[PDB]
Design a protein around this ligand. Structure first.
Ligand SMILES: [Zn+2]
Ligand SMILES: [Zn+2]
Ligand SMILES: [Zn+2]
Lengths: 171, 87, 112, 551, 178, 270, 107, 97
DNA sequence: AGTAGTTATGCCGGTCA
DNA sequence: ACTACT
RNA sequence: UCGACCAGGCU
């Protein structure tokens, strides 16, 4: 899953920053605008790699105000989830509708009726849990989830998964 | 494509700077000098942006590059440094 | 030989009046009228029928008709013409616009 | 401009893809259904009915409202809506092609009337260039008036091969008003070609046939010349013009839509009613009229859809037609800010390239200088100076895009600039400016001069720059444009300053000389007979500003 | 101000066709094996199993803090804190993601030896499997070839039960300890 | 109509004149690459005059007591008489001059010798003279090889086109053909010494300016040549306040229209 | 080449473009009485090896369509038996530059 | 005053690119519209406020630009559309050449 | 024939919904 | 008032 | 806020 994609970005530098430590200010701007960002297109952009050799190229000067626009060619580590992708993470929240597992920078949600049947919801617990003949899932338990579907949204991706198939559930 | 970037060698365009090029350099620099960008010469008391630009150009200290386009899309880059300034 | 005569004729019209126009000018006109192959008239029928962009052509003589036929035949405009840009409010590729300008991070450091 | 920040990346237009609207897209784009021909007054209540102008399109009443979009009128471009028509109608502007395409395809089956099987056709089919190809293809098979089912292959005219079927004879087509009529030929069989009919045949034309006939599968397929769903242009295109309240001020276009709207509703309520079959079609051609009249209203079939009062009604096409037109009079040229004009009169005391500017004008025309440590002082002086004294200023514009009006602002006297802010200051001595005299025949009708603010109300120019403009002082007027950017002015001073323009490339010689008084007199001052004594020679020397002080 | 990506296919207006993604190894167009490098050369998709990812990130944030000072001139539970520092030094501090990713990665990492990870990679990079599967097999603890072929349907016919079960064995060993 | 039909024609960075389609219209602007502002009418002496005076002017026969440079001109005047190695050059020179003369009479059949051409050479020499107060009394100090190989070398730099290849290089040589005739017409050994009386210094100077002044007269890629050309014709037609053949505005109209049924449609037969 | 006198059969010529490669050319007699190419205003043209052309295009970065065209029925075009695609090199005198070299592709 | 066709020519003649663009925009029209990257139309429903964009019908919400063109031109396009003609505006080229 | 398309630049009273 | 094209 | 159409006059 986790990928390393070759991306690029455009930055418009005011003329004031047309100093000597310019390359530095761009490389900075890049990281400010990219690391932490999210798109359904490339998923979560987590970390820009090889800081040292970020290609700045020659920026062209806009022609009415005097800013320049550089096309910063970088490379980075991204995280885009998928439907049918098996992933395991830790629990975070848990109600009567299901519980939310956290895989990486993202959060997956397991709906009650997407769990096995013999697995019940013990409300009269704390932290709230889900009990089975054998299992006891809750707040911090690690779980192996199958991502059933994703929903790209704003600055993040969210999905819903099940643990009703085989070899899925707590670990 | 950048398969359109004609090497510093093999350049065939004029070695000299065109009135248009230069008119546009002095103007661009003046603009940025007025935008409070860094100035690369000593303002011998100069305080007019175009003046400061003409001065930067006379001391070939203008960090700009003219990207000349050929009718096909090819292009040769020339620095104001390089470019002669007979005009 | 046509181009030759065409110039010769054009020239006479101007010299007959007792004026002088440096050859290159009439030359250029004369040539434009012939390059394509025969005699293209400085007329809505002649020149305004080449492959220049729709937008360019519509700025002379047959405006809407040209724009209509333009949508019918799904034309594509390069926006290489002075006119297209004037219409789009963009810097036209002429004199000051015949080339781009960039800050060279390199030389920008040698200066200090 | 068109203000307020937008996070959307900003680029320039590189290409323009022309095409035709598919009824589907029109429906897709549409933000509003549009059923009622009423402007608004929700039953007389000043507002807008969910029917015409703003059933969610742009706005009116200086009211951000605009189907959330908000932003308010200056920012909100229009928003298209639509009208599902009652029956397909031609597009006034395509009728000609619509017809010529029929004369190229076979009705009933929709296949070309000439294959590679015909050679004179292949020759055309090779012609690369939509325009000319379709030009041939037509002339070629316009005559072919039978959908031949079998042709003698490139072997012997003996064994004839098979292609497309149905040999149905082909109607000889002619145009009548906005109607296409054919006569399949003892004696012909005259009959009118219905739109729904022509539409279907076009829809059946094959994709390859499309193209061979200069069209395009993605951007402009034949069928689209036939309007089915009509795009409704937003308020901005057809803005009103109110007179306070309880009145009106609708636009011609807003009416012709109402016409179309009415005309449509009428038709439809005849197909859901007692449809006297050919009393309907009598009201269908009315729609064809309006929907045609709205785009073009200066056709050949004389009914020039006049409006109540006889005035013709501007068709959209009128809006774009040459000079004064949209294109020619709004884009290839337009009225502009920062310009000034007055009577001119020569002044034998200005330098060739100066331009005497009346103080009153110097105080109106302004330049947007940016606050720099280089000019903080000078600029603050001007701001404090005022918009009324001469060397002064009118506005101070802060980083936080807001104008401080130095003539009212309770802080006019106050104000302390800010590196980066801008002070719109008065035009001052030596500002480069474009000066011109119309008609503008050659470069030299527009040269850049140095300003010299001066008394009285007339632009004063040096006599020798007289010829280039072709001005005399019989009362000619001259225009003047003040450059606004740091580079804009650079372009003037560096490229078109009067001194540069001196030797003209028009006729490889100078284009300004010595004239009138100076010419007449320079001769006299020259004649061997002309002698000058000390007292005067001394003044004459002094008058020359460079004179090295050497008698 | 967006963020482009080494391949621009024509916007023939007809913007409709792009399927959904799945365990049919049908990731976006933005993730096909055949994708173009920044030096415009074809280069196979680069998927990373966890840990192999925890290393990649950590290494970069390191050489960063380094150059973030060349110009300055003029144990599972234990790594959690050691990393929480490198972060508040080279990261943006609001990268709640890169932080959460560093823990998640640090905790669920199967191999924590730049060598063991290499071993893993060589081992799998002989299967001829898709970068994604190779990624999953690497970061998902599997025993029966069944558990594998089941959490990774993409496989199924791509590798025999015994052969896949072999590699699985190997994987359970190179499986660095804690 | 003129302007609308040339809007988009401008000299490109390769010295080609094209429109907005990239279609060539003039391979080298004005068939010479020169900007019109930098041109002046100059006389090409070589073309006119009798063969009699042509020889008396440009001919230098070192192997002759009556056709050599008298030593009052050139310094090495006496020690040059009879030099066979030099007459090879002087004959090579006088051969070209004579070839030029025929080539000019070929281009300008008329015999007309005054034509607009870049770099005014008459002046560029007068300054040369006065700058160095060159006295027509003493003798020069120019090697007969000095002159000849210098002028020969000056040509090598009157660049208009640049590319490294034959098609272009040839184009270049074409572009400069007529100018060079002028050049040789004026920098002929005989003239240079008998007429101008230039010293070796004054000479190297004239050669330097002639070079610069040339490079300066070349057209600037960018120049909106189209519109310029349009207005340059239109403007004077405006002042046309009008041998009985349709002439003037009505005729011009006729022409631009490619008018099939022109009014006066004479035809002159020789 | 076939120099007819007062014309050829409207059925006869229907047999010229029928024996390729080899091509046939028809010419009227009265049309060749005077040689046009010899006319004052007519400059020297010149065919160009498919290579000489490929070079012309390469050295000027031209597409074919960017070259000044000449009519297939242009007098001088026929005189040299030009064929759609070939390029002539027109060389003429110049009151500006002595000699100038232009190119014309065949339509 | 009117900087008309003829004065436009004179600027082209001087080769004064910027001064022309500035005279036809900054000094007159100039407007900011948002276009779709799929269909070159001014469809996009920009809500510069909540940072939302979108162009249903193309169902876009990501591929969107903003361009500066003379209001008269926005009009020219909307008018051309009203007449069922699509004058798509694209920020990148394809036709190369 | 029939069929349309133009025509210089720019600036400065009086009826109609 | 004139001029070309379908 | 602010338009259209017509007609007339100056260069
Ligand atoms: Zn809106
Ligand atoms: Zn049929
Ligand atoms: Zn869209």
């Amino acid at each position: 899953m986790f990928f390393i994609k070759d991306l690029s970005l455009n930055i418009t530098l005011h003329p004031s920053f047309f100093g000597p430590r310019m390359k530095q200010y761009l490389k900075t701007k890049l990281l400010e605008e990219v690391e932490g960002s999210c798109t359904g297109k490339f998923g979560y952009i987590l970390c820009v790699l090889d800081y040292d050799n970020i290609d700045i190229q020659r920026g062209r000067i806009l022609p009415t105000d005097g800013s320049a626009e550089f096309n910063v060619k970088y490379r980075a580590v991204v995280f885009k989830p998928f439907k049918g992708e098996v992933v395991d993470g830790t629990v975070v929240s848990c109600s009567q509708h299901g519980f939310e597992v956290q895989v990486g920078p993202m959060k997956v949600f397991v709906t009650k009726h997407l769990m096995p049947q013999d697995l019940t919801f013990n409300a009269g617990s704390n932290p709230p849990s889900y009990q089975s003949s054998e299992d006891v899932i809750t707040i911090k338990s690690r779980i192996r989830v199958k991502i059933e579907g994703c929903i790209s949204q704003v600055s993040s991706i969210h999905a819903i998964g099940s643990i009703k198939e085989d070899y899925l559930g707590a670990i | 494509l950048k398969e359109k970037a004609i090497p510093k060698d093999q350049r065939a365009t004029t070695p000299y700077m065109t009135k248009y090029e230069r008119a546009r350099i002095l103007g661009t620099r003046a603009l940025q000098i007025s935008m409070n960008a860094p100035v690369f010469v000593d303002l011998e008391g100069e305080t007019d942006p175009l003046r400061i630009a003409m001065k930067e150009l006379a001391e070939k200290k203008i960090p700009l590059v003219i990207r000349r386009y050929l009718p096909d899309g090819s292009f040769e880059d020339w620095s104001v440094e390089e470019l002669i300034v007979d005009l | 030989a046509g181009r030759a005569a065409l110039y010769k004729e054009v020239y006479n019209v101007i010299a007959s009046d007792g004026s002088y126009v440096n050859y290159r000018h009439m030359a250029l006109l004369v040539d434009v009228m012939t390059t394509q192959g025969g005699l293209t008239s400085v007329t809505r029928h002649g020149f305004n029928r080449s492959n220049t962009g729709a937008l360019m052509r519509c700025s002379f003589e047959e405006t809407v008709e040209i724009l209509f036929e333009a949508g019918a035949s799904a034309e594509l405009d390069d926006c290489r013409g002075v006119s297209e840009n004037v219409i789009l409010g963009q810097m036209a590729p002429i004199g000051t616009g015949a080339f781009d300008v960039m800050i060279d991070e390199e030389s920008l450091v040698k200066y200090m | 401009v068109g203000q307020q920040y937008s996070s959307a990346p900003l680029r320039t237009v590189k290409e323009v893809q022309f095409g035709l609207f598919s009824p589907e897209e029109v429906r897709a784009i549409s933000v509003a259904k549009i059923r009622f021909p009423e402007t608004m007054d929700e039953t007389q209540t000043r507002a807008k009915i969910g029917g015409l102008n703003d059933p969610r399109l742009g706005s009116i009443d200086r009211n951000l409202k605009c189907q959330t979009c908000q932003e308010g009128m200056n920012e909100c471009p229009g928003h298209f809506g639509h009208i599902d028509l009652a029956k397909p109608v031609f597009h006034v502007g395509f009728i000609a092609k619509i017809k010529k395409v029929c004369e190229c395809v076979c009705m009933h089956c929709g296949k070309l009337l000439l294959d590679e099987h015909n050679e004179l056709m292949r020759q055309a089919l090779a012609i690369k260039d939509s325009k000319k190809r379709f030009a041939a293809i037509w002339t070629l098979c316009k005559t072919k008036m039978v959908c031949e089912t079998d042709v003698p292959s490139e072997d012997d005219p003996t064994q004839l091969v098979s292609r497309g079927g149905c040999g149905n004879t082909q109607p000889t087509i002619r145009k009548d008003g906005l109607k296409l009529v054919g006569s399949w030929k003892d004696e012909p069989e005259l009959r009118v070609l219905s739109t729904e009919e022509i539409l279907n045949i076009f829809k059946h034309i094959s994709v390859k046939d499309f193209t061979s006939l200069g069209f395009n599968e993605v951007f402009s397929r034949p069928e689209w010349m036939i309007l089915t769903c009509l795009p409704v242009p937003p308020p901005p295109v057809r803005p009103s013009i109110s007179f306070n309240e309880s009145q009106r001020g609708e636009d011609d276009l807003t009416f012709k839509l109402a016409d179309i709207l009415k005309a449509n509703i009428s038709l439809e309520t005849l197909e859901h009613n007692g449809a006297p079959h050919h009393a309907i079609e009598e009201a269908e051609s009315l729609l064809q009229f309006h929907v045609a009249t709205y785009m073009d209203n200066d056709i050949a079939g004389q009914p020039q859809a006049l409006q109540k009062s006889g005035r013709p009604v501007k068709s959209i096409r009128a809006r774009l037609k040459g000079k004064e037109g949209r294109i020619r009079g709004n884009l290839m040229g337009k009225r502009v800010d920062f310009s000034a004009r007055t009577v001119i009169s020569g002044d034998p005391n200005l330098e060739l390239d100066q331009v005497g500017v009346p103080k009153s004008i110097a105080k109106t025309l302004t330049y947007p200088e940016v606050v720099t440590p280089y000019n903080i002082d000078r600029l603050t002086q001007l701001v404090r100076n005022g918009p009324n004294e001469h060397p002064g200023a009118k506005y101070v514009i802060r980083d936080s895009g807001d104008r401080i009006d130095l003539r009212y602002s309770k802080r006019a006297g106050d104000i302390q600039l800010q590196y980066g802010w801008k002070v719109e200051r008065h035009i001052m001595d030596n500002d480069p400016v474009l000066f011109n005299r119309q008609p503008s025949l050659h470069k030299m009708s527009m040269m850049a001069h140095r300003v010299k603010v001066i008394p009285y109300s007339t632009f004063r120019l040096n006599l020798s720059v007289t010829s280039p403009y072709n001005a005399d002082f019989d009362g000619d007027e001259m225009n003047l444009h003040v450059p606004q950017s740091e580079e804009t002015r650079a372009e003037l001073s560096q490229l078109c300053a009067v001194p540069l323009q001196i030797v003209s490339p028009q006729s490889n010689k100078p284009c300004m000389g010595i004239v009138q008084d100076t010419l007449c007199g320079i001769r006299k001052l020259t004649l061997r007979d002309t002698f000058i004594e000390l007292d005067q020679v001394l003044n004459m020397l002094y008058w020359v500003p460079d004179w090295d002080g050497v008698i | 101000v967006s963020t482009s990506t080494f391949q621009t296919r024509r916007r023939r207006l007809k913007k409709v066709e792009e399927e959904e993604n799945a365990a049919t190894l049908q990731l976006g167009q933005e993730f096909q094996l055949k994708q173009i490098n920044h030096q415009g050369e074809e280069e196979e998709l680069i998927a990373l199993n966890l840990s192999e990812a925890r290393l990649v990130i950590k290494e970069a944030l390191v050489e960063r803090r380094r150059a973030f000072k060349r110009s300055q001139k003029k144990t599972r539970e234990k790594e959690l804190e050691s990393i929480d520092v490198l972060l508040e030094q080279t990261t943006g501090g609001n990268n709640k993601d890169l932080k959460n990713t560093m823990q998640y990665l640090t905790n669920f990492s199967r191999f924590r030896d730049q060598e063991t990870v290499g071993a893993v990679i060589q081992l799998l990079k002989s299967t001829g499997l898709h970068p994604f599967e190779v990624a999953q097999l690497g970061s998902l603890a599997c025993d029966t070839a069944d558990e594998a072929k089941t959490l990774i349907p993409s496989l199924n016919n791509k590798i025999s039960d015994d052969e896949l079960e072999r590699i699985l064995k190997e994987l359970s060993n190179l499986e660095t300890l804690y | 109509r003129l302007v609308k039909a040339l809007e988009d024609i401008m000299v490109h960075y390769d010295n080609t004149t094209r429109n907005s389609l990239g279609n060539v219209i003039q391979f080298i602007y004005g068939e010479d690459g020169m900007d019109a502002a930098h041109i002046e009418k100059q006389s090409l002496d070589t073309i006119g005059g009798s063969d009699a005076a042509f020889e008396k002017r440009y001919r230098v026969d070192l192997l002759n007591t009556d056709h050599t440079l008298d030593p009052s001109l050139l310094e090495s005047g006496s020690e040059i008489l009879g030099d066979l190695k030099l007459q090879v050059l002087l004959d090579e020179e006088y051969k070209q001059l004579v070839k030029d003369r025929k080539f000019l009479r070929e281009v300008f059949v008329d015999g007309e010798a005054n034509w607009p051409l870049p770099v005014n050479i008459r002046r560029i020499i007068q300054n040369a003279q006065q700058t160095f107060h060159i006295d027509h009394t003493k003798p020069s100090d120019l090697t007969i090889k000095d002159i000849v190989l210098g002028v020969k070398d000056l040509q090598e730099n009157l660049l208009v086109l640049r590319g490294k290849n034959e098609i272009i290089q040839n184009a270049q040589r074409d572009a400069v053909t007529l100018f060079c005739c002028l050049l040789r017409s004026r920098l002929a050994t005989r003239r240079v010494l008998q007429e101008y009386r230039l010293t070796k210094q004054a000479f190297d100077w004239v050669l330097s300016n002639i070079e610069a002044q040339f490079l300066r007269s070349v057209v600037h890629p960018g120049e909106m040549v189209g519109v310029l050309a349009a207005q340059s014709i239109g403007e004077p037609a405006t002042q046309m306040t009008l041998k009985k053949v349709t002439s003037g505005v009505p005729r011009l109209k006729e022409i631009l229209n490619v008018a099939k049924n022109m009014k006066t449609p004479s035809l002159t037969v020789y | 080449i076939f120099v007819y006198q007062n014309n050829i059969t409207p059925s006869a010529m229907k047999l010229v473009p029928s024996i390729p490669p080899a091509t046939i050319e028809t010419f009227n007699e009265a049309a060749l009485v005077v040689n046009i190419t010899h006319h004052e205003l007519v400059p020297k043209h010149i065919r160009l090896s498919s290579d000489e052309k490929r070079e012309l295009l390469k050295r000027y970065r031209l597409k074919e369509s960017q070259l000044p065209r000449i009519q297939r029925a242009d007098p001088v075009a026929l005189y040299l038996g030009l064929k759609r695609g070939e390029v002539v090199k027109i060389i003429r005198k110049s009151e500006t530059s002595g000699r100038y070299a232009s190119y014309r592709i065949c339509m | 005053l009117r900087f008309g066709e003829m004065e436009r020519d004179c600027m082209i003649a001087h080769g004064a690119a910027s001064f022309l663009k500035e005279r036809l925009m900054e000094a007159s029209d100039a407007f900011r519209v948002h276009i779709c990257g799929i269909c070159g139309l001014m469809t996009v429903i920009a809500k510069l406020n909540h940072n939302q964009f979108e162009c249903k019908g193309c169902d876009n919400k990501i591929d969107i630009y903003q361009i500066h063109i003379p209001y008269a031109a926005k009009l020219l396009f909307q008018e051309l559309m009203a007449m069922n003609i699509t004058p798509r505006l694209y920020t990148d080229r394809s036709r190369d050449f």
